[PDB]
Ligand binder design. Structure first.
Ligand SMILES: [K+]
Ligand SMILES: [K+]
Ligand SMILES: [K+]
Ligand SMILES: [K+]
Ligand SMILES: [K+]
Ligand SMILES: [K+]
Ligand SMILES: [K+]
Ligand SMILES: [K+]
Ligand SMILES: [K+]
Ligand SMILES: [K+]
Ligand SMILES: [K+]
Ligand SMILES: [K+]
Ligand SMILES: [K+]
Ligand SMILES: [K+]
Ligand SMILES: [K+]
Ligand SMILES: [K+]
Ligand SMILES: [Mg+2]
Ligand SMILES: [Mg+2]
Ligand SMILES: [Mg+2]
Ligand SMILES: [Mg+2]
Ligand SMILES: [Mg+2]
Ligand SMILES: [Mg+2]
Ligand SMILES: [Mg+2]
Ligand SMILES: [Mg+2]
Ligand SMILES: [Mg+2]
Ligand SMILES: [Mg+2]
Ligand SMILES: [Mg+2]
Ligand SMILES: [Mg+2]
Ligand SMILES: [Mg+2]
Ligand SMILES: [Mg+2]
Ligand SMILES: [Mg+2]
Lengths: 80, 81, 200, 134, 87
RNA sequence: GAGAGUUUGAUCCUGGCUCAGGACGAACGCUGGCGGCGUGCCUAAUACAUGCAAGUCGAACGCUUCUUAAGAGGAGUGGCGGACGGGUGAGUAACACGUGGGUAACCUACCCAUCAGAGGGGGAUAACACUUGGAAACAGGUGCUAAUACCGCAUAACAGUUUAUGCCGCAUGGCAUAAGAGUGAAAGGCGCUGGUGUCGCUGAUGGAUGGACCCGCGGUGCAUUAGCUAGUUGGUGAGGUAACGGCUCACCAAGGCCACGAUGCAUAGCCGACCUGAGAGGGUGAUCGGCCACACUGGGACUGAGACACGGCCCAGACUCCUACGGGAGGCAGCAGUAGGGAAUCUUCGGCAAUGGACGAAAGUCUGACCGAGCAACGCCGCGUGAGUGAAGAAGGUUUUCGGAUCGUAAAACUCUGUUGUUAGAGAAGAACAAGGACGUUAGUAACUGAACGUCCCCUGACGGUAUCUAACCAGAAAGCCACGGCUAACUACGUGCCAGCAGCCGCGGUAAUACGUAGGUGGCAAGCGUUGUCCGGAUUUAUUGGGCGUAAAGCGAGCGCAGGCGGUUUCUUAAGUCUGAUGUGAAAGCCCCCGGCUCAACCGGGGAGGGUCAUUGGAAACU
């Protein structure tokens, strides 16, 4: 069975019911000068029970669109 | 139109539209009667449910609606019962 | 386009004998025109590079575009000196092959025979003077054209042939048995200067 | 600069500009706007034909034409060669090219094109000056 | 439907064809699903190169040979193998 | 991986400017022989005369008009096609595109494969016949008539859902089985002998194809643009879709986005690729292929498997046109062509033979796709415009220091050649076919006709008497353009005297100018040559590769500090970065590499390689 994309990130907003905003924080090399630059890609995840709190590390897996901007599902709470 | 077949398609599509919309309205009325029966709480609600299910499936035949469109109605209709 | 002008004035512009005999440089071994006999300023290095390049393409009677493209292909040869490999490809030109085998006294004559269709490659007629001849291919005169004074004079007139050529004076059929080595071609031509010319 | 600076503010190069800007702009009659179309030449009408003076080292009576182009731009152009048949309201074809003597002249008039005649008596470099082989 | 058909190639007055599996609606020289052979008609005995397993696989899937490609497949004997596969 | 000129009296440095190269859908000027191949509105997505660009089926159905009842039409109904092919790039910075994934949120005519059905009825309707109105478009009225047109009833749950079990996943869930309730289809045509062949018809499933949606990453300028957002962000239900979803709605919250550049503005179809460069890069996005978008401007839906549909409908608008003034008609960014714009881009051609597409059982019909031909040196490639011998070197031109130089072995002369050209002749491939006539083999059948396949006979060329070949005849008809002060290869005479003119830069011209104009020479390239425009190079002149800031341009007047960037030694650990292996994929064409085909080359064909800061997975662990 094929697999979806799972990313590790940090909760930066839980002021919305059943949803969290996550930040993945990868690093990319500059196309010209080659230096590694910090890059933040943040996602909206459907929190089943508003479990994960702000400033928490959480794993999210991709899913079908759950709302206008939701595309991901909370999987694990790795750190509180 | 300019092409003869296009001229003929105007007539045939117009005729198809009249038939399609009449039969579709029939399906909507059949559904409408059943739903209104449920609101009133009638006695023959069973017959109207069957006719509502009959109308939707017959509409799926003739392809006035899609099979999935029919299935969603049938599930919805049954819930109302 | 072919150059059909006077031949001597080309050799004395280049300071070499394009026919390899010297009759062009015997009298008035200086450039053509009224300014020839008397003294002029030193040629620039660009002029030195220009004249060396013009030596070769005048030697084999080619226009500049064809000369450029052949020089480009000679670069693609991975092994060997760029300039040397270029000189070999000029020699393998069907024009030159006809003249080397002795079927014509001059390269213009060799080109005239190839162009007009008197020559056959591996028994098959080829009328392209630019045609590139592999080692071992047989170059012959057309069966209708074997009895023309011009080739027969050339066949008997030429008393020497390059070591890299096989020839049969009866069949009028010859072939290069291997590539020419640099020393076998014109030593007076400095191919290094040509390479640097097109390098600019 | 450090690498981080170049990441923050990358290198940026000077933008070049045309020597002959009036040839870079077309005109759309409908929208009444100027299009950016690179054209090797442009037709115009001579609003004024006369003579001009050079800058300090040189002295002559250089021949120009004040040409209003088909793109509505107003340009000063030079009439090369000896003698010309241009007059005001003539249709002339302009090519690029400054004239170092004349400060405001950035275009030359093409000889032998449109109303411009070839140069009389010319015998060398005829393709310039637009004269047929004698 | 899916066709096994010829895509024209070569130069003017010197046609060369690739045998391709393509959707019927795609342009003749345009989109195609897969190349399965070549067809050189300028040769007095026509030269054909064929990936027979590829062709045989597509025929089993319902691909419809074009008129000339069907002849090409018969000479190479593939149309016989497909007939025996259906049996 | 080449450099040169130009700041000074001279110098070194800094520094700009300029030039030598390549390129092009070019244009222009001069010139112009041929052939192969390719290319040809870049501007006004401006307006468009005329012809053509989609039709097909009588083996679905009923009429009608002829042919001496055959054959041939003519319009109906009905089916399929018309959403492909072709054009354009206006809009679009947007999951549009490119690349990598996901869908357990999807649909799919025609084509294959399987398991089933294909039973009984019915009422119509054009065509037609009369007839009403109308200028015309076209509408109606009454009376008939058929179907594979339409509609019921019947029979089908293998579909969906519910439930019970088992198995399993990534949360919603997925798969199979079993039951259970409610309902749902259809059509006949041709031909052999009620049975049966074959093409169609209905239900379900799987394939293949095509489409749809979601997501990571990637490719423009401007903050002298920082705030934006209110179905907006999320939820709960409902409704809607093929499908998930604020897709819509009613409610309940209030969020969402943004200096990692939101929003706004400007510009732009994107890509494979193409030009350039030593490369890193820069520029471009013609032709060819893929994707997207649009079709007079705006909006809408209908029909359909599929369109919100270039040559369909409706409405509105601007424009052109026809009216009998009541009302009608139209949309070349299809192929040609015209007008207009412009520096500037083609014939109102032949054919469907080939290949591909639509319809048909097929013959076949249709196809401005496409094959061809025409026009243009617009580009690339090939070949010519002759070859050999030929004077201490004719005449003539130019010039002399008047001796001679030079144009010049050039010419002449003599001997040759026929690529070409002309004249006659000889003549391709490109065709494979289909259909049809023979037999044969399989599966099936009571037997068949036929189906699938195999083998033979027969059958078709727009190009076009084209390429090509052969023979005869004559060098006879077939070269120019620019440059020559330095850069920069090539020099002298006159004429002119800061004039006339040249010029890319430096600069030339003021009465003895290799720089202006002519001539003779000469150089470069050559059916071209030059000029202009545009891009890359040279330019290390934005420097990542690859520069600088005491006095040449350049250290903020100085501190304190948020974010950010960077950061001492070491054990274990991890492994995001980094390195590495495998697999998947990065279409075809193109450059490149081999290999073949065209007499060569261009060009064509075959086989590779390359190309990702790609994904999945296994490794390594110094460095961050
Ligand atoms: K029809
Ligand atoms: K100076
Ligand atoms: K300099
Ligand atoms: K259709
Ligand atoms: K994507
Ligand atoms: K909702
Ligand atoms: K566009
Ligand atoms: K539109
Ligand atoms: K249409
Ligand atoms: K055809
Ligand atoms: K027609
Ligand atoms: K055929
Ligand atoms: K000069
Ligand atoms: K640097
Ligand atoms: K300071
Ligand atoms: K690691
Ligand atoms: Mg040429
Ligand atoms: Mg000049
Ligand atoms: Mg053949
Ligand atoms: Mg256009
Ligand atoms: Mg645009
Ligand atoms: Mg029916
Ligand atoms: Mg029923
Ligand atoms: Mg460079
Ligand atoms: Mg049209
Ligand atoms: Mg001939
Ligand atoms: Mg010089
Ligand atoms: Mg001069
Ligand atoms: Mg640079
Ligand atoms: Mg100072
Ligand atoms: Mg300073």
């Amino acid at each position: 069975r094929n697999q979806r994309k799972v990313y590790q990130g940090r909760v930066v907003s839980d002021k919305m019911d059943k949803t969290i905003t996550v930040v993945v924080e990868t690093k990319k090399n500059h196309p010209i000068y080659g230096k590694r630059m910090k890059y933040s890609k943040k996602y909206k995840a459907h929190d089943e029970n508003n479990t994960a709190k702000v400033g928490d590390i959480v794993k999210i897996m991709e899913t079908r669109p759950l709302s206008a901007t939701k595309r991901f599902r909370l999987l694990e709470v790795v750190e509180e | 139109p300019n092409i003869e077949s296009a001229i003929k398609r105007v007539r045939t599509s117009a005729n198809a539209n009249a038939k399609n919309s009449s039969q579709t309205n029939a399906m909507r009325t059949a559904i409408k009667k059943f739903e209104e029966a449920v609101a009133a709480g009638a006695d023959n609600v069973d017959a109207l449910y069957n006719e509502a299910v009959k109308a939707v499936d017959m509409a799926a035949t003739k392809g006035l609606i899609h099979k999935n469109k029919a299935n969603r109605d049938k599930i919805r209709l049954s819930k109302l019962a | 386009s072919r150059y059909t002008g006077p031949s001597w004035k080309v050799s004395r512009r280049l300071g070499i004998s394009l026919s390899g005999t010297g009759k062009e440089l015997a009298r008035r071994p200086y450039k053509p025109g009224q300014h020839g006999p008397n003294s002029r300023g030193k040629v620039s290095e660009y002029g030195m590079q220009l004249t060396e390049k013009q030596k070769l393409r005048h030697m084999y009677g080619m226009n500049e575009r064809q000369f450029r493209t052949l020089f480009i292909k000679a670069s693609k040869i991975k092994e060997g000196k760029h300039g040397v490999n270029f000189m070999v490809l000029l020699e393998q030109r069907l024009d030159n092959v006809v003249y080397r085998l002795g079927l014509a006294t001059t390269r213009r004559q060799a080109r005239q025979l190839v162009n007009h269709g008197h020559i056959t490659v591996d028994g098959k007629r080829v009328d392209i003077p630019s045609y590139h001849v592999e080692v071992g291919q047989v170059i012959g005169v057309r069966e209708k054209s074997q009895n023309i004074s011009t080739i027969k004079e050339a066949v008997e007139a030429t008393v020497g042939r390059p070591a890299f050529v096989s020839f049969d004076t009866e069949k009028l059929e010859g072939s290069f048995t291997r590539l020419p080595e640099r020393d076998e071609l014109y030593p007076e031509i400095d191919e290094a200067l040509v390479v640097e010319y097109y390098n600019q | 600069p450090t690498i981080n600076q170049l990441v923050r503010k990358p290198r940026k190069s000077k933008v070049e500009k045309s020597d002959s800007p009036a040839l870079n702009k077309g005109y759309n009659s409908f929208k009444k706007t100027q299009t950016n179309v690179n054209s090797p030449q442009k037709r115009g009408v001579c609003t004024r034909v006369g003579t001009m003076t050079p800058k300090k080292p040189n002295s002559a009576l250089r021949k120009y034409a004040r040409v209003r182009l088909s793109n509505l731009i107003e340009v000063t152009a030079y009439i090369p060669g000896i003698g010309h048949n241009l007059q005001e309201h003539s249709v002339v074809l302009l090519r690029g090219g400054r004239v170092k003597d004349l400060p405001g002249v950035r275009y030359h008039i093409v000889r032998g094109a449109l109303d411009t005649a070839g140069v009389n008596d010319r015998k060398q470099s005829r393709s310039k000056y637009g004269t047929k082989r004698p | 439907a899916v066709k096994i058909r010829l895509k024209r190639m070569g130069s003017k007055k010197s046609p060369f064809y690739r045998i391709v599996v393509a959707d019927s609606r795609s342009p003749r020289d345009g989109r195609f699903i897969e190349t399965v052979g070549t067809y050189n008609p300028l040769k007095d005995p026509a030269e054909v190169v064929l990936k027979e397993d590829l062709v045989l696989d597509w025929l089993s899937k319902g691909a419809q040979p074009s008129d000339t490609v069907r002849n090409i497949l018969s000479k190479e004997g593939v149309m016989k193998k497909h007939h025996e596969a259906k049996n």
